[PDB]
């Protein structure tokens, strides 16, 4: 039940910037993006230690309430007890999550939604700032 | 039907910073703060030209769907076609609103709420930045 933002109307090309602080006892946190809570074109879930994963980013989609296939990244540029910033955009092919220091993750656009109208944060991540570009 | 943010969990003393761009032909816009759409401890409505009023800030509350006693500020530090930032805090007595950028007025806390969990923007005001401190 973390921060939820609706009616974002984030169209392709536009950038969603999110800055927040990661808890010191961080297990994992979640950034959800899509149309609503049941239609997520991006489930961004860095896991420090959660569900057996250690220092692993887990991405997925949810379509009509149904989870898609999990995609995993070896690179884990997140440290517990620190401030994490992500820049998010998308096109017809992929969603792109960029980190300031150069890290960039791609996740296939599986929902093909016209825009991102929904953002929800959860887990050990307290959002401090959100910008729309 | 503008931006809506829920589960803010804004405790007393904490600052809610909101930046957005006011349309050149703006008639009015709204910042709603409270628990939900039916319970607003602050209805912040600058009216450039609306409901017969002009260059007047209209503040009110909504408690259980019912509008409280409307109140107005003689001062109007908003320009159509320009970027406006509003900083908002509250104690158990008043809400404090900081307008661009020397301006500060108190609005009585009439809902007594523990925290601000709900923000909704509307009217001729496209949100570009929201910060929580
Ligand atoms: O079929 C059961 C599966 O369940 C998921 S976890 C589940 O998956 C989703 C992603 O698809 C969401 O992350 C979801 N979620 C998290 C939150 C949340 C809520 C609040 C805060 C916060 F932070 C987070 N809400 N929803 C998770 O519960 C397991 O990973 C998966 N599995 C696959 C592997 C696996 C392990 C090692 C290597 C490998 F390749 C795969 N290790 N487990 C398998 O056991
Ligand atoms: O009952 C009649 C009253 O009606 C309100 S209008 C009403 O006020 C509410 C707050 O008090 C809400 O703002 C409400 N609202 C706005 C929006 C919205 C929704 C979407 C976008 C967007 F931008 C905005 N939604 N809801 C308004 O409709 C007038 O203030 C009021 N009155 C007028 C005067 C008055 C008149 C002339 C001169 C003068 F000095 C005072 N002095 N009192 C009086 O005539």
Numbering used by the authors:
A (entry chain B), B (entry chain A): 2 to 134
What's the publication's text?
Galectins are small, soluble lectins characterised by conserved β-galactoside-binding site (subsites C and D) within their carbohydrate-recognition domains (CRD, ~130 amino acid residues), and they can form multivalent lattices with membrane-associated glycosylated ligands. All the observed CRDs of galectin family adopt a typical β-sandwich fold composed of two antiparallel β-sheets of six strands (S1–S6, S-sheet) and five strands (F1–F5, F-sheet). Concave surface of S-sheet contains conserved amino residues and forms a primary binding groove to which specific glycans up to a length of tetrasaccharide are bound. In this model, the best structurally characterised subsites C and D are responsible for recognition of the β-galactoside-containing disaccharides, whereas the other subsites (A, B and E) remain poorly understood regarding how they contribute to ligand binding interactions.
Galectin-1 has one arginine (Arg73hGal1) at subsite E and none at subsite B, whereas galectins-3 and -7 contain an arginine at both subsites. However, TD139 bound to galectin-7 with only a 15-fold increase in affinity compared with TDG binding, in correspondence to a small difference in the binding free energy (ΔΔGTD139-TDG) of −1.7 kcal/mol. This relatively small increase contrasts with the ~300-fold binding enhancement measured for galectin-1 binding to TD139 compared with binding to TDG; galectin-1 has only an arginine (Arg73hGal1) at subsite E. Protein-ligand interface analyses (PDBePISA) performed on all the complex structures indicate that galectin-1 provides the most buried surface area for TD139 binding (383 Å2) than galectin-3 (372 Å2) and galectin-7 (285 Å2). In galectin-1, Ser29 and Val31 correspond to Arg144hGal3 and Ala146hGal3. Even though the 4-fluorophenyl moiety appears to fit in a similar manner into the pocket formed by Ser29hGal1 and Val31hGal1, the substituent is displaced from Val31hGal1 by ~16°, resulting in the formation of only two fluorine-protein interactions in comparison with four observed in the galectin-3 complex. The manner in which the 4-fluorophenyl-triazole moiety of TD139 is situated in subsite E is a consequence of the salt-bridge networks of galectins, i.e., Asp54hGal1-Arg73hGal1-Glu71hGal1, Glu165hGal3-Arg186hGal3-Glu184hGal3, and Glu58hGal7-Arg74hGal7-Glu72hGal7. Because the 4-fluorophenyl-trizole moiety of TD139 is found to flip over at substie E of galectin-1, the aromatic substituent becomes close to Asp54hGal1 for formation of anion-π interaction, which is favored by the fluorinated arene (i.e., an electron-deficient π system). Taken together, the comparison among these galectin/TD139 complexes indicates that the common arginine-arene interactions at subsite E are substantial, despite the small differences in their respective interaction geometries.
